[PDB]
Design a protein around this ligand. Structure first.
Ligand SMILES: CNC(=S)c1cccnc1
Length: 165
């Protein structure tokens, strides 16, 4: 192991990403990308410049689980390869902001039952599973949440460490 993981998470910022469906998380895992609404895009871009690591922790709505977590490797950009997201009903692709590149740190799931002892000070100390898309998770809570995930032995954090910074 957990030492490189702890190193990557040291003084990180953490954001809860709430996905409408599993398809979009599958695309994010396959392509190493995420795109969010402009209100959250601006927050993530600010955070990317502010901290050594910015961690997105993903949860598919109604799944009762987190599906993994990833580290921003870039601010958002436009004009790249299109991504065929499965958008919420009533939302067009033009409503999204740009695309963030991300490096996955853990592609394994964690059920909410395992994080019930973690509360987020930045959301009224509600359980960390509770939060709108884009809710920031305070450092200690976010670190402990990430450490609860099963180890993902397919991941080598050596290359992520070199990107820090
Ligand atoms: C791929 N991004 C999607 S589906 C989304 C939708 C609404 C808010 N944030 C993100």
């Amino acid at each position: 192991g957990t030492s490189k993981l702890k190193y990557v998470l040291q003084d990180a910022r953490f954001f809860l990403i709430k996905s409408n469906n599993h398809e979009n998380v599958s695309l994010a895992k396959a392509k190493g990308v995420w795109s969010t609404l402009p209100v959250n895009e601006k927050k993530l871009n600010l955070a990317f410049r502010s901290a050594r690591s910015v961690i997105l922790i993903f949860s598919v709505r109604e799944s009762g689980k987190f599906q993994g977590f990833a580290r921003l490797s870039s601010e958002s950009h436009h004009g790249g390869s299109p991504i065929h997201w499965v958008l919420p009903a009533g939302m067009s692709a033009k409503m999204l902001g740009g695309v963030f590149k991300i490096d996955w740190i853990c592609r394994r799931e964690l059920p909410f039952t395992k994080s019930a002892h973690l509360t987020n000070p930045w959301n009224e100390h509600k359980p960390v599973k509770i939060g709108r898309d884009g809710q920031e998770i305070e450092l200690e809570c976010g670190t402990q949440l990430c450490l609860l995930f099963p180890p993902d032995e397919s991941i080598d954090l050596y290359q992520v460490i070199h990107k820090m910074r």
